[PDB]
Amino acid sequence: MKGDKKVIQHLNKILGNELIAINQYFLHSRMWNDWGLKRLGAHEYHESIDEMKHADKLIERILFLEGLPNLQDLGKLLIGENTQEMLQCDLNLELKATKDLREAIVHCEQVHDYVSRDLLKDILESEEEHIDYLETQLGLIQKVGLENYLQSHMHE
Amino acid sequence: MKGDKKVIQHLNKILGNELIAINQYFLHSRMWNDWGLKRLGAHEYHESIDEMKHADKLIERILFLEGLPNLQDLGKLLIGENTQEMLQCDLNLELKATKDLREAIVHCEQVHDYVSRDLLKDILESEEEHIDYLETQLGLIQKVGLENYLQSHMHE
Amino acid sequence: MKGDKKVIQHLNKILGNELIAINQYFLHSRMWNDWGLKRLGAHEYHESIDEMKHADKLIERILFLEGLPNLQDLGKLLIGENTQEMLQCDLNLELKATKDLREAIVHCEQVHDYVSRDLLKDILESEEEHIDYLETQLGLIQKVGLENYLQSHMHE
Amino acid sequence: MKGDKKVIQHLNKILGNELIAINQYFLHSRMWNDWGLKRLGAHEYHESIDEMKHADKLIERILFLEGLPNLQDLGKLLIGENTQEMLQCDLNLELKATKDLREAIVHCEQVHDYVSRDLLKDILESEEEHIDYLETQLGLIQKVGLENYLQSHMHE
Amino acid sequence: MKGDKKVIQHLNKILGNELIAINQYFLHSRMWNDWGLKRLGAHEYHESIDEMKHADKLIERILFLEGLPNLQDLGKLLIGENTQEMLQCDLNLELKATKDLREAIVHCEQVHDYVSRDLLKDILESEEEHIDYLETQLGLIQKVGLENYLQSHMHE
Amino acid sequence: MKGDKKVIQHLNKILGNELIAINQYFLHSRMWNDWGLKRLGAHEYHESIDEMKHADKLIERILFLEGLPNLQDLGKLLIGENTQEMLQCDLNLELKATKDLREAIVHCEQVHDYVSRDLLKDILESEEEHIDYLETQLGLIQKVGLENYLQSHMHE
Amino acid sequence: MKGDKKVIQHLNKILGNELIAINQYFLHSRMWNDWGLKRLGAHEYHESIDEMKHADKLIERILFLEGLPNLQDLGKLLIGENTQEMLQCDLNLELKATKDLREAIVHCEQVHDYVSRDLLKDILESEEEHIDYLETQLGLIQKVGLENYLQSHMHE
Ligand code: HEM
Ligand code: HEM
Ligand code: HEM
Ligand code: HEM
Ligand SMILES: O=C1NC(=O)c2c(NCCCc3cccc(O)c3)cccc21
Ligand SMILES: O=C1NC(=O)c2c(NCCCc3cccc(O)c3)cccc21
Ligand SMILES: O=C1NC(=O)c2c(NCCCc3cccc(O)c3)cccc21
Ligand SMILES: O=C1NC(=O)c2c(NCCCc3cccc(O)c3)cccc21
Ligand SMILES: O=C1NC(=O)c2c(NCCCc3cccc(O)c3)cccc21
Ligand SMILES: O=C1NC(=O)c2c(NCCCc3cccc(O)c3)cccc21
Ligand SMILES: O=C1NC(=O)c2c(NCCCc3cccc(O)c3)cccc21
Ligand SMILES: [Fe+2]
Ligand SMILES: [Fe+2]
């Protein structure tokens, strides 16, 4: 079904953000596992899988709309050097992602692609849940102290 | 069954206290959940539910006694800005509540409304259990330190 | 996540409406039970519980958006003196509630808070189902007569 | 298998009757549900489904006989404005339906299409069962009064 | 264990009231069953059984306190001749019973027979539940009309 | 609940499209079954049933909004004479259907009927899934050839 | 455990190849699904997942050896425009991948990193299995003809 060209451009932009997130979260997960912080490693793994599932749905939608899904261009990964930095890098990425999702929803609404809007709204709900998690973790570091925070994320 | 008018006023005063506590504990619960202190959030949620159940029983008793349950007047919520203050705010509310329960029981006994007394005694037992919980939490903060106390209440 | 100030004001207005409804429906439920109209009492209890669940979600969303949920201000309860009046009172409240929900959805759409809009849309679906129930009950009173209508609501 | 042309014309006439009945009964069912008369709504829904099943068998038989099933021409729906009228509209439609079924059976017998006759006889048995139901409901309205009759059809 | 003489006199007075209630409720139950009002008959049978259980506990307590339980001196049964009167007769009996229970509890408290008091308080709770049932039934007769009220009590 | 007059006109237009699709898909299903192409017949049957379910929800919404659902006017069925034509007829119908759904959603949004919008969005998601199916079938005929395509749809 | 610098460079080269394959196979999978060739889509999805698992093991090994896994550089995806081209693109990629794996194994052997060798040998076994699959499909296209080959991959 031939989609709106600018809708497809927006969907590819969202896909591009998800592809960054997949790799950033996967690498952060495996870093945390290597450091013995396996509760963080497992949670971050599940965040990476969630982004993979969003990317799949975007690819499927773009193809249905007779566009070409762009899996070739990978933007800049934001990789931290310690737990605090890694959490903040994920939050920085998520804030960019939600800004782009909102702009894409505006355009879908304008051209009456209500099904693409609904898909993006569902992804946005997942991204806001991730922001909630990240903001909460950063706040817990301040409340319990970094050493306690890391202690609490050693074991699954 | 026509109840004593002052018993009904006492029951409405206790109901008023329960209505404050429902909202205070529900808000404290959801604050703690938002902050990632999910064990505190869950415990405080169950405290809010318990006050809802007491309020139900008071409403039912007032109607049986042919009075009008007052759910319109809501007194001042005591909302803290951090965990220590929230616990003290709950304790301050509970101490007011048990004072008022004791005065209501005295009156029920004087007019021979022994069934209303039995209801209020059961509620008083619940409120003294809550006081026990709160005093214990405040004491634990002193024994283990605030950072450890909060750490222990991150995960359910 | 820092939410829009006016969105938070709208969510607090909806929450205020839900808090009125919780208490109005709970009292109506317990009045109907006291009168032996237990099918109405049970249905109205479930309506109160559903409003409690909506209030919970509103509180959680307001806190995520870094606002202060207002559980202190309680508006006017519309309490009837007989079944016909109680049902009409509930309907009057629901019609105010849906007006406020629609105005809140408009504003969420305009600041691109699509997740808050989705929550409010879900609440609006619930409130329109309640309107359907209420209009249907008032119509049945006319079709079967008041005595029969009440008879049919004695037994669960 | 090449069927008799007039048999196929009769089958298309019966199919036309069933298509009116599907839509009339479905609308009556949803009107009754909207009004809170759920037992009537459910029973009328099942009547609509039964007509759908008859239409299916007629379509299948017409195609086997190498005719074209007419799903395009929809005759006049008899929609009532209250329960009494709705039941009588259903009964008026059924009495026309059974007259047409008998005339079709006569013709099938004359040209030795005994399998089409058997199908039409089975449909006729179903339509006479519906007539029994309708006559019985109209009689009950007289015996128990309209308000009681409607009361008895509020709840499933 | 040697009981207070006046406590034992009070317990025998309460026992006498229960013995009246056993017979009154049992006869009302069987009258309602004979009339085809089986839901009333069954409910009233269970009321009679409850009074039998209270009488048992009073007899046991009196014997423990080394008194003689008086099962000989049966007071006046309040027997109605139609449903509304039978319910009112039960209510009149229950109101006398609860007045006597309160006076007995006062005396138990004065002489420190706290276990006798607790037994009487439990009986008082049961009798107030019966009062609630009775007042509710009388109110339902007013709200739904006598003919509907009786209709609703034909079947279990 | 008094709905917007023009919303109700749009819902009746969508309902009219669904009524065409029910009959067109049901007839195509039974044609394919008669020809021995039972996998197509079954799939097309389920498409017809899905349109029946959408029509039901539209009728229910129209009645709730105090409109009259139009089941009387039946537009033009697009009936093919072979598999390729039947699939393209279904696709032509679905493309008209989605255009009308988008126009209806625009209007519902403009008059703040967000619940009707949500219903129509869900229907649009179902219709876009049907368009995906149809486009895919037409493409498969080109890729595997008509003879193989039909072979693959003989057995359920 | 400090690894050999050149071993880590080889592991990152193999990782780089796996990252290309993940995306290439995922896109080919979703292209085939969009075209209705669901058995090819499913198989190609499982090939993508298998490459994801290999990449995970490489990332984990590189981190254990105190290197930095390179998830940032993504090489050229080889995307076909039809089934034959897509299969050949996958085969071309696999043949480059196995050449790189053999060179990496040579070096691991030379510096006595026998555990890294064993990991790469297991990956090489998987990639040769994929080559077997791909060569076999290309051969089947020649033996059964493209139309039959595609027909056989419509249904899972
Ligand atoms: C650095 C790149 C990637 C890595 C390391 C990776 C890793 C993984 C792993 C380890 C799994 C779990 C497999 C299992 O044990 O069953 C998985 C699942 C999955 N991956 Fe990836 N993946 C990557 C990229 C992608 C991409 C780009 C996509 C899609 C565009 C994707 C889509 C999926 C899907 C759909 C699943 C299945 C999730 C589920 O339903 O459980 N992955 N991935
Ligand atoms: C008059 C004030 C209230 C009364 C009398 C009341 C009463 C009740 C009762 C009796 C229950 C069922 C408890 C059980 O047996 O499990 C309940 C559940 C609940 N209440 Fe309330 N409540 C009140 C106010 C509130 C408020 C203000 C909130 C939130 C803002 C709230 C949130 C809840 C929730 C979330 C549940 C559990 C619902 C479920 O998932 O089943 N309630 N309430
Ligand atoms: C001193 C007076 C009475 C006492 C203390 C007494 C006590 C009891 C007790 C303790 C039970 C067992 C209840 C249970 O645990 O389920 C019982 C059952 C019963 N009583 Fe009485 N009762 C008395 C008089 C009567 C009278 C006057 C009648 C009838 C006219 C009666 C009819 C029954 C019946 C029908 C049962 C159920 C028996 C069965 O089917 O198991 N009772 N009674
Ligand atoms: C106003 C038009 C119609 C409406 C609203 C409608 C509605 C429905 C609904 C709601 C169902 C049940 C679906 C489910 O939950 O599984 C159904 C079933 C069915 N319909 Fe219709 N329908 C319509 C017209 C037709 C027509 C014209 C035919 C055939 C000529 C038909 C044939 C069937 C059949 C065979 C079933 C399955 C019944 C069974 O075996 O349980 N329908 N319909
Ligand atoms: O990252 C990438 N996404 C892409 O589509 C892509 C390439 N595609 C070449 C056209 C293939 C084709 C044909 C017909 C229907 C289709 O859907 C696709 C090539 C390189 C990279 C990418
Ligand atoms: O918080 C509140 N509690 C209440 O009762 C109430 C109001 N009551 C007005 C009607 C009371 C009535 C009259 C006649 C028969 C009855 O059964 C009851 C009104 C506002 C607020 C409240
Ligand atoms: O109904 C009510 N809702 C409220 O929030 C409230 C009150 N809030 C006091 C400050 C809460 C605070 C402070 C700092 C950081 C936080 O995260 C939260 C006070 C009274 C009543 C209410
Ligand atoms: O296709 C059709 N849809 C319809 O509603 C309809 C007809 N309606 C007659 C009045 C229904 C009525 C009256 C009063 C209160 C109500 O609630 C409903 C008549 C013919 C065809 C249709
Ligand atoms: O209704 C009546 N209740 C009675 O107790 C009673 C009678 N009691 C005679 C003495 C029984 C007794 C009790 C305890 C220890 C003993 O050694 C003996 C005689 C007639 C009627 C009654
Ligand atoms: O079989 C029987 N044994 C009896 O005592 C009895 C009757 N007594 C009537 C007394 C005064 C009265 C009158 C009306 C209701 C009452 O509750 C009381 C009367 C009839 C049968 C019996
Ligand atoms: O309501 C309707 N019923 C119908 O058959 C129909 C139409 N038929 C078009 C030709 C079907 C065809 C052609 C060749 C071989 C076949 O086996 C079948 C057209 C419009 C409406 C209807
Ligand atoms: Fe009746
Ligand atoms: Fe073949």
Side-chain angles (χ1 to χ4, degrees), chain A residues 1 3-4 7-56 58-75 77-98 100-102 104-128 130-146 148-156, chain B residues 1 3-4 6-56 58-75 77-95 97-98 100-128 130-155, chain C residues 1 3-56 58-75 77-98 100-128 130-156, chain D residues 1 3-4 6-56 58-75 77-98 100-128 130-156, chain E residues 1 3-4 6-56 58-75 77-98 100-109 111-128 130-156, chain F residues 1 3-56 58-75 77-98 100-128 130-155, chain G residues 1 3-4 6-56 58-75 77-98 100-109 111-128 130-156:
Chain A
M1 191 185 81
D4 178 85
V7 166
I8 292 160
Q9 287 178 331
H10 277 285
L11 296 177
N12 263 320
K13 184 170 186 183
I14 304 312
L15 174 58
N17 294 339
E18 297 285 337
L19 293 167
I20 295 168
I22 289 165
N23 287 17
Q24 174 174 320
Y25 301 163
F26 205 90
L27 179 55
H28 281 166
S29 168
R30 273 43 193 145
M31 292 167 62
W32 275 319
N33 282 340
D34 177 66
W35 300 346
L37 297 164
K38 310 274 181 128
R39 191 180 277 248
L40 280 161
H43 189 278
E44 193 76 346
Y45 171 86
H46 291 118
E47 296 291 3
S48 182
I49 297 283
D50 286 338
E51 297 294 89
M52 291 172 206
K53 294 173 164 177
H54 304 324
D56 187 17
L58 292 160
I59 291 162
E60 292 172 330
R61 184 74 185 158
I62 290 165
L63 287 169
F64 172 59
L65 296 181
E66 302 184 27
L68 294 182
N70 184 345
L71 284 78
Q72 180 65 91
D73 297 331
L74 183 61
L77 313 186
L78 309 181
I79 305 304
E81 294 175 339
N82 57 48
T83 292
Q84 298 179 93
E85 293 183 356
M86 295 153 78
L87 289 164
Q88 185 65 50
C89 284
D90 289 359
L91 182 56
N92 291 343
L93 190 65
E94 287 295 310
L95 292 171
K96 170 60 154 49
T98 57
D100 289 350
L101 279 157
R102 295 177 209 286
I105 288 167
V106 169
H107 185 69
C108 290
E109 183 71 14
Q110 184 183 50
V111 304
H112 316 303
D113 187 356
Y114 299 120
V115 178
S116 292
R117 165 168 176 153
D118 201 43
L119 170 61
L120 296 181
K121 181 270 294 182
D122 289 342
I123 293 171
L124 178 60
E125 287 181 335
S126 168
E127 302 310 338
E128 290 195 2
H130 195 182
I131 289 169
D132 193 8
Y133 165 84
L134 291 165
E135 295 179 327
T136 296
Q137 301 323 109
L138 290 164
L140 284 168
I141 286 164
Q142 301 302 134
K143 285 180 174 77
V144 312
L146 180 61
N148 278 350
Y149 180 81
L150 298 177
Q151 179 187 27
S152 288
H153 288 82
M154 280 178 26
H155 299 325
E156 286 183 69
Chain B
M1 194 182 76
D4 179 83
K6 184 61 170 187
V7 168
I8 293 163
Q9 293 177 331
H10 272 293
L11 296 179
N12 264 321
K13 183 174 192 183
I14 304 309
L15 173 56
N17 291 343
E18 297 284 337
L19 293 170
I20 293 165
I22 290 169
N23 290 16
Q24 180 171 316
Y25 303 163
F26 205 89
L27 179 53
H28 280 166
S29 166
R30 270 48 189 142
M31 291 166 62
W32 273 318
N33 283 341
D34 180 65
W35 301 346
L37 299 164
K38 307 286 188 109
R39 185 179 206 104
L40 274 163
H43 190 276
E44 189 78 347
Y45 168 85
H46 294 300
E47 297 285 0
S48 184
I49 296 296
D50 282 356
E51 298 293 89
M52 294 174 204
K53 296 180 182 168
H54 303 325
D56 187 15
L58 291 160
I59 292 163
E60 294 172 328
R61 183 75 184 159
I62 292 162
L63 292 167
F64 170 63
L65 296 181
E66 300 182 31
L68 296 177
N70 184 349
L71 284 78
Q72 178 67 90
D73 297 333
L74 184 62
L77 315 183
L78 313 176
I79 304 307
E81 310 196 41
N82 59 51
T83 293
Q84 298 184 269
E85 292 182 2
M86 295 153 77
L87 291 166
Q88 189 62 53
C89 283
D90 285 1
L91 182 51
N92 289 343
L93 191 69
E94 286 297 304
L95 291 168
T98 58
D100 292 348
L101 279 155
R102 291 179 210 287
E103 295 175 6
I105 287 161
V106 167
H107 182 71
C108 289
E109 178 73 13
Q110 289 190 356
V111 300
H112 309 336
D113 185 355
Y114 300 118
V115 178
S116 292
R117 167 170 174 153
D118 202 44
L119 172 58
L120 296 173
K121 178 272 292 181
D122 289 347
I123 295 174
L124 179 62
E125 286 180 336
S126 178
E127 305 304 340
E128 284 192 10
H130 195 180
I131 289 168
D132 194 13
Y133 167 81
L134 294 164
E135 293 176 332
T136 300
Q137 304 322 111
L138 290 164
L140 285 171
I141 287 167
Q142 298 304 312
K143 290 180 172 73
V144 309
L146 183 59
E147 287 189 336
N148 277 350
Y149 179 83
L150 298 180
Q151 177 187 34
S152 287
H153 288 84
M154 283 175 38
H155 299 142
Chain C
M1 197 183 71
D4 177 83
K5 168 175 165 84
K6 289 183 180 72
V7 165
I8 290 161
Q9 292 177 341
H10 276 291
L11 299 176
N12 263 323
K13 185 170 192 180
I14 307 311
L15 171 60
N17 291 339
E18 297 283 338
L19 295 167
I20 295 171
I22 291 168
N23 288 19
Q24 178 173 317
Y25 300 164
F26 205 92
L27 180 51
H28 280 165
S29 167
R30 268 48 189 146
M31 292 167 62
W32 274 319
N33 283 340
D34 176 61
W35 300 346
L37 296 164
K38 311 269 193 169
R39 187 185 292 251
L40 278 162
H43 191 278
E44 191 80 344
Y45 169 85
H46 288 122
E47 297 287 3
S48 185
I49 296 287
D50 283 354
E51 297 296 272
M52 293 173 208
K53 292 180 176 183
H54 303 326
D56 186 14
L58 289 161
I59 293 165
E60 293 173 332
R61 181 77 185 158
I62 290 160
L63 293 166
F64 170 63
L65 296 180
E66 299 180 23
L68 297 177
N70 184 343
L71 289 73
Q72 179 68 87
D73 296 335
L74 184 62
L77 312 188
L78 311 180
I79 308 302
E81 304 186 319
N82 59 46
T83 294
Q84 298 181 269
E85 295 184 1
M86 292 154 75
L87 291 164
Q88 186 63 49
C89 281
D90 289 359
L91 179 55
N92 292 342
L93 191 67
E94 289 293 327
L95 291 169
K96 168 54 146 52
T98 58
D100 291 344
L101 278 154
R102 293 180 210 287
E103 295 179 0
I105 287 169
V106 165
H107 185 67
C108 290
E109 178 75 13
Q110 290 314 124
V111 301
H112 307 157
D113 188 351
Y114 300 119
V115 180
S116 292
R117 165 172 174 150
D118 199 45
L119 173 58
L120 296 176
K121 182 273 289 179
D122 289 346
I123 293 172
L124 176 63
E125 289 180 337
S126 176
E127 303 307 339
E128 287 192 8
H130 192 185
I131 290 170
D132 195 8
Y133 166 82
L134 290 165
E135 292 174 328
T136 297
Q137 304 322 107
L138 291 163
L140 282 168
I141 287 169
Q142 300 301 314
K143 289 187 173 64
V144 310
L146 185 61
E147 283 191 344
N148 273 356
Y149 176 82
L150 299 177
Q151 177 187 32
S152 292
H153 287 84
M154 283 176 34
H155 301 320
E156 287 179 66
Chain D
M1 193 184 71
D4 179 84
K6 184 64 175 164
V7 165
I8 292 162
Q9 291 178 322
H10 276 289
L11 298 177
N12 263 321
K13 184 175 187 177
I14 304 314
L15 174 58
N17 290 339
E18 296 283 340
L19 295 168
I20 293 163
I22 289 168
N23 287 20
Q24 178 171 319
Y25 304 162
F26 205 91
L27 181 53
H28 281 165
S29 165
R30 273 46 191 145
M31 293 167 61
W32 274 319
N33 283 342
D34 182 67
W35 300 345
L37 299 165
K38 311 289 193 165
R39 185 182 293 247
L40 274 166
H43 190 278
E44 191 78 346
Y45 170 83
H46 294 302
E47 296 287 0
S48 184
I49 297 290
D50 286 351
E51 296 295 89
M52 292 175 207
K53 290 180 181 167
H54 303 326
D56 186 16
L58 291 161
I59 292 162
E60 294 173 328
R61 180 79 186 158
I62 292 162
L63 288 168
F64 171 60
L65 297 177
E66 299 181 29
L68 294 179
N70 187 344
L71 284 78
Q72 179 66 91
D73 295 334
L74 182 63
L77 313 184
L78 311 180
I79 304 313
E81 310 194 335
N82 56 50
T83 293
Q84 297 181 273
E85 290 179 14
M86 292 154 79
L87 290 166
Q88 186 64 51
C89 286
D90 286 0
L91 180 55
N92 290 342
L93 188 72
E94 290 290 324
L95 294 167
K96 170 151 204 306
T98 59
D100 293 341
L101 281 157
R102 297 179 205 285
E103 288 180 16
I105 289 165
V106 169
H107 182 71
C108 289
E109 182 70 16
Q110 292 190 339
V111 304
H112 307 157
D113 185 354
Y114 299 119
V115 177
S116 292
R117 165 166 177 158
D118 200 44
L119 173 58
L120 294 177
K121 178 272 293 182
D122 289 341
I123 293 172
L124 179 60
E125 285 177 341
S126 176
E127 304 304 345
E128 286 191 8
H130 196 179
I131 289 166
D132 194 10
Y133 167 82
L134 290 164
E135 293 176 328
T136 297
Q137 303 323 107
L138 292 164
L140 288 168
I141 287 170
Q142 298 303 308
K143 282 179 179 72
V144 308
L146 182 64
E147 282 189 340
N148 277 352
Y149 178 82
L150 297 178
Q151 179 187 31
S152 290
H153 288 82
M154 278 176 37
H155 301 322
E156 298 189 65
Chain E
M1 196 181 79
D4 179 93
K6 182 64 160 172
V7 168
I8 292 166
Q9 291 178 321
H10 276 289
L11 296 177
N12 263 321
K13 186 168 188 174
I14 306 306
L15 171 58
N17 291 340
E18 297 284 337
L19 293 168
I20 293 167
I22 290 164
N23 289 19
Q24 177 171 319
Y25 302 163
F26 204 89
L27 181 55
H28 281 166
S29 166
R30 272 45 192 148
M31 290 167 64
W32 273 319
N33 286 342
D34 176 66
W35 297 343
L37 298 167
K38 303 288 181 103
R39 184 177 196 109
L40 278 165
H43 190 278
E44 188 78 346
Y45 169 85
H46 294 299
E47 297 288 357
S48 184
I49 297 289
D50 286 348
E51 296 294 90
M52 292 176 208
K53 294 180 183 180
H54 302 327
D56 186 14
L58 289 162
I59 292 161
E60 296 174 327
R61 183 75 183 159
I62 291 161
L63 289 168
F64 171 62
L65 297 180
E66 301 179 26
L68 296 174
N70 185 345
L71 286 78
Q72 177 70 89
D73 293 332
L74 185 62
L77 312 187
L78 306 183
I79 304 304
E81 285 167 76
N82 60 73
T83 292
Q84 189 162 353
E85 183 180 25
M86 298 152 76
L87 293 164
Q88 188 64 52
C89 285
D90 292 359
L91 180 55
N92 290 347
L93 185 69
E94 288 284 339
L95 289 172
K96 169 54 158 42
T98 59
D100 292 347
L101 281 159
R102 294 175 210 289
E103 295 181 4
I105 290 166
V106 165
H107 183 71
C108 289
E109 180 73 15
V111 302
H112 304 162
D113 186 353
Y114 301 117
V115 179
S116 288
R117 164 170 175 149
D118 199 45
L119 170 60
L120 296 175
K121 179 271 293 179
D122 290 341
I123 293 171
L124 179 60
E125 287 180 334
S126 170
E127 305 305 340
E128 290 194 5
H130 193 186
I131 290 170
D132 192 12
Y133 166 83
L134 289 161
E135 291 180 326
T136 295
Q137 302 322 109
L138 292 164
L140 284 168
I141 287 170
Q142 296 305 308
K143 288 180 175 74
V144 309
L146 183 60
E147 285 196 328
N148 280 346
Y149 180 83
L150 297 177
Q151 179 186 29
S152 291
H153 287 81
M154 287 179 25
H155 304 310
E156 301 181 61
Chain F
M1 195 183 68
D4 179 85
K5 177 178 194 302
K6 176 63 66 172
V7 168
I8 293 162
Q9 292 173 284
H10 276 285
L11 298 178
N12 264 322
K13 186 175 191 172
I14 307 311
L15 171 58
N17 291 339
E18 294 285 335
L19 294 168
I20 293 167
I22 292 168
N23 287 19
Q24 174 170 318
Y25 302 163
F26 205 89
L27 180 54
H28 281 164
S29 168
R30 272 47 191 145
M31 291 167 66
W32 275 317
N33 283 341
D34 182 70
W35 302 346
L37 296 162
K38 308 292 200 194
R39 180 180 297 246
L40 278 164
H43 190 280
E44 189 81 344
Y45 170 83
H46 290 116
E47 297 288 0
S48 187
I49 296 289
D50 283 349
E51 299 290 87
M52 296 175 206
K53 291 174 178 180
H54 304 321
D56 188 15
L58 292 161
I59 293 161
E60 291 170 331
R61 183 79 185 155
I62 290 163
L63 287 167
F64 168 61
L65 295 179
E66 300 183 30
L68 296 177
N70 183 345
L71 286 79
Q72 179 68 89
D73 298 333
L74 184 62
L77 315 187
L78 309 177
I79 304 306
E81 310 198 332
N82 58 46
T83 295
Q84 301 185 261
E85 294 185 3
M86 295 155 75
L87 293 165
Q88 186 64 53
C89 282
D90 289 0
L91 180 54
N92 291 343
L93 192 68
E94 290 287 330
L95 293 167
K96 167 59 160 49
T98 55
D100 291 346
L101 282 156
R102 295 176 207 289
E103 294 173 9
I105 287 165
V106 166
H107 180 77
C108 290
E109 180 73 16
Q110 286 174 331
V111 302
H112 314 292
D113 187 351
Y114 300 117
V115 176
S116 293
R117 166 169 177 154
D118 200 47
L119 174 57
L120 293 176
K121 183 269 296 178
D122 289 342
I123 296 175
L124 176 65
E125 288 179 333
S126 179
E127 304 305 342
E128 284 191 9
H130 194 177
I131 290 168
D132 196 5
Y133 167 81
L134 288 165
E135 291 179 329
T136 297
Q137 297 329 105
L138 290 166
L140 284 168
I141 288 168
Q142 296 305 310
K143 287 182 176 64
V144 312
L146 183 60
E147 313 66 32
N148 278 348
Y149 179 83
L150 298 179
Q151 173 185 32
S152 289
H153 288 82
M154 281 183 32
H155 301 323
Chain G
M1 196 188 75
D4 177 91
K6 182 66 170 177
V7 166
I8 291 164
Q9 288 177 318
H10 276 288
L11 295 178
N12 261 323
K13 183 168 184 175
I14 305 311
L15 175 58
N17 295 336
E18 297 283 335
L19 293 168
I20 297 165
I22 291 164
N23 288 18
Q24 178 172 319
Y25 303 160
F26 206 89
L27 181 56
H28 282 165
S29 169
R30 271 48 189 145
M31 290 167 63
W32 276 317
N33 282 342
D34 180 67
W35 300 347
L37 299 164
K38 311 285 184 112
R39 185 188 192 108
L40 275 166
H43 190 276
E44 188 77 349
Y45 170 85
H46 292 303
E47 297 285 3
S48 186
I49 291 292
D50 279 341
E51 299 292 275
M52 289 174 209
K53 293 174 170 177
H54 302 327
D56 188 16
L58 289 163
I59 291 164
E60 295 173 326
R61 183 76 182 157
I62 292 162
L63 290 164
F64 170 62
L65 296 180
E66 298 177 23
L68 294 176
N70 184 344
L71 282 77
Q72 178 69 87
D73 297 329
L74 183 61
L77 311 187
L78 309 182
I79 303 303
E81 292 179 346
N82 56 52
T83 293
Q84 300 179 268
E85 288 183 9
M86 297 154 74
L87 292 164
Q88 184 67 51
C89 283
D90 288 0
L91 181 54
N92 290 343
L93 190 72
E94 288 294 315
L95 291 167
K96 162 55 154 40
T98 57
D100 289 348
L101 278 158
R102 294 181 209 284
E103 289 177 14
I105 287 164
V106 165
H107 183 70
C108 291
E109 180 73 12
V111 303
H112 307 156
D113 186 353
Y114 300 118
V115 179
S116 291
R117 167 171 175 149
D118 199 46
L119 174 55
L120 298 174
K121 182 271 298 183
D122 289 343
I123 294 171
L124 179 61
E125 286 180 335
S126 180
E127 302 310 338
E128 289 195 3
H130 194 181
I131 290 169
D132 195 5
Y133 164 83
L134 288 163
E135 294 179 328
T136 299
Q137 307 319 113
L138 288 165
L140 284 171
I141 288 174
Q142 299 302 314
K143 290 184 177 66
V144 311
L146 184 62
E147 284 190 338
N148 274 357
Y149 179 86
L150 298 180
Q151 178 188 33
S152 289
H153 288 84
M154 282 178 36
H155 299 326
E156 281 188 56

